Amino acid sequence: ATPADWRSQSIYFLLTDRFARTDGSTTATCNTADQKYCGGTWQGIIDKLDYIQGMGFTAIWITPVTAQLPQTTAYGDAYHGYWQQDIYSLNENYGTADDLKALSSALHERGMYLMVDVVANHMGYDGAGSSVDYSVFKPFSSQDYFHPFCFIQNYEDQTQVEDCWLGDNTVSLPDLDTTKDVVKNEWYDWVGSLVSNYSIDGLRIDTVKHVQKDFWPGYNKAAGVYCIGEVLDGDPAYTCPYQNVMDGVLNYPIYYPLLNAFKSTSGSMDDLYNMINTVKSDCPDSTLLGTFVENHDNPRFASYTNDIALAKNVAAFIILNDGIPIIYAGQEQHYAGGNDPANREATWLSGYPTDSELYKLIASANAIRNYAISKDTGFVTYKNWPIYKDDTTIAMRKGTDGSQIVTILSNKGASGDSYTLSLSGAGYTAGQQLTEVIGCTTVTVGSDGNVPVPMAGGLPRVLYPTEKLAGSKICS
Numbered sequence: 001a002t003p004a005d006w007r008s009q010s011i012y013f014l015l016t017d018r019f020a021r022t023d024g025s026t027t028a029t030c031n032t033a034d035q036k037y038c039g040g041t042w043q044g045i046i047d048k049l050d051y052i053q054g055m056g057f058t059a060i061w062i063t064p065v066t067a068q069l070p071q072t073t074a075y076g077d078a079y080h081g082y083w084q085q086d087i088y089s090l091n092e093n094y095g096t097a098d099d100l101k102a103l104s105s106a107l108h109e110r111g112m113y114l115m116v117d118v119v120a121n122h123m124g125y126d127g128a129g130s131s132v133d134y135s136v137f138k139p140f141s142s143q144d145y146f147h148p149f150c151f152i153q154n155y156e157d158q159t160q161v162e163d164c165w166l167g168d169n170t171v172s173l174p175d176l177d178t179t180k181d182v183v184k185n186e187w188y189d190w191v192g193s194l195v196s197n198y199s200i201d202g203l204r205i206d207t208v209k210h211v212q213k214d215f216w217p218g219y220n221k222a223a224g225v226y227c228i229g230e231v232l233d234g235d236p237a238y239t240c241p242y243q244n245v246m247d248g249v250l251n252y253p254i255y256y257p258l259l260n261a262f263k264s265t266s267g268s269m270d271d272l273y274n275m276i277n278t279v280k281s282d283c284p285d286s287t288l289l290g291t292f293v294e295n296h297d298n299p300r301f302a303s304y305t306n307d308i309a310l311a312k313n314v315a316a317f318i319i320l321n322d323g324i325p326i327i328y329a330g331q332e333q334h335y336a337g338g339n340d341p342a343n344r345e346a347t348w349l350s351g352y353p354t355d356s357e358l359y360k361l362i363a364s365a366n367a368i369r370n371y372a373i374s375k376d377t378g379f380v381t382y383k384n385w386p387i388y389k390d391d392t393t394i395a396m397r398k399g400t401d402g403s404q405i406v407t408i409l410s411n412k413g414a415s416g417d418s419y420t421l422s423l424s425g426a427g428y429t430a431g432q433q434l435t436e437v438i439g440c441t442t443v444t445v446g447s448d449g450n451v452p453v454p455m456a457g458g459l460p461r462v463l464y465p466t467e468k469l470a471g472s473k474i475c476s
């Protein structure tokens with residue numbers, strides 16, 4: 001439930017509707033352009049727990065659970081869960097309050113945490129904000145519970161960004177006035193009981209920049225478990241300060257330079273080394289941010305480049321950076337959907353192969369991370385530090401002196417020449433034996449402390465003291 005506890009977790013983010021069906025189908029059609037319920041359920045999930053778990057994940061984040069407007073709107077169905085009308089009732093398309101129960105239960109039983117996405121900024125309604133029937137919302141049954149109708153025309157304007165409505169003339173999202181002790185009151189109450197009732201460990205919160213700053217603290221205190229919020233802004237100067245009002249925020253400041261460093265063979269490694277330091281110095285606790293390169297609101301990685309060397313590099317950055325690693329369902333199967341709705345593909349259609357290239361990379365990076373933290377209680381709080389950078393390389397170091405992992409990432413791609421990198425600044429002793437745990441090869445520390453790192457095929461390299469791998473299963 002705890003911030004301090006969520007520090008050692010790694011999350012699999014899935015859209016309930018699109019991860020796993022109850023009949024375990026792997027072929028049922030799911031056309032994204034149609035934007036309708038495809039059929040995923042909470043039972044399908046419980047049924048594919050070994051698939052998540054064998055990638056080394058320790059928790060899953062699932063989309064909102066509240067009862068949605070019922071219509072098929074001009075923009076599709078509420079399959080994503082972000083247009084609620086009734087929060088004391090569940091979206092019957094995913095299952096039953098029992099099902100939601102079993103899942104929290106299968107998870108907990110396997111040592112996993114359950115994170116649930118929640119909305120507080122708004123409701124959803126099929127029509128013009130002007131004709132809304134506030135009598136459908138439960139419990140916000142009067143327009144008196146809502147800011148008056150206006151749409152955000154300028155986002156650089158923060159009071160209108162928080163007080164006007166998101167959405168449009170087609171699908172309107174009635175904006176609550178969270179300023180009133182009533183809105184508040186009910187919202188604090190609800191969050192708290194919801195958590196209790198299904199036993200979830202953390203909350204992912206939507207549209208945080210749309211609610212004025214002051215609502216959150218009590219939101220976060222009432223919930224009683226870790227809250228990570230969505231602040232959709234790339235400026236650390238705008239986003240980080242929310243850390244002053246809730247445990248963590250999603251790493252959007254790192255997202256933009258990370259994508260840009262690995263999306264091309266010419267990506268800038270400077271912008272990323274630089275952003276890694278800025279977030280480390282200016283954000284309250286970089287160790288409580290969530291790292292990500294893909295989600296359902298942005299084109300997937302492989303839409304920008306089909307190179308698997310590059311895909312392999314960004315996946316290993318996210319698992320090994322400071323914070324909670326988050327991988328979006330489909331990333332591991334190299335899905336390449338573009339903007340919404342193309343980036344909400346059903347995971348089942350890949351067949352759920354555990355021998356996929358990104359599946360294996362992800363699994364072997366979660367492996368090391370999971371073990372290091374078994375043996376270095378300082379790892380989750382040691383701040384990642386870029387020790388080196390070149391036009392096609394960056395290398396970082398995290399973990400207590402003596403038990404430190406040194407990751408070497410590169411953007412040379414699936415060609416990328418074969419040459420030796422003499423990496424200085426690792427801080428391993430001379431003559432010490434290191435294991436590259438991705439490829440399970442060994443290298444020996446210099447004499448001068450330099451590590452002759454063998455590079456090829458633009459592959460990521462992750463080093464760790466061979467000695468420290470022991471009663472370890474990492475490379476046998």
Ligand SMILES: [Ca+2]
Pocket residue numbers: 121161162163164175176210211
């Ligand atoms: Ca608002």
Ligand SMILES: [Ca+2]
Pocket residue numbers: 206207230
């Ligand atoms: Ca959102």
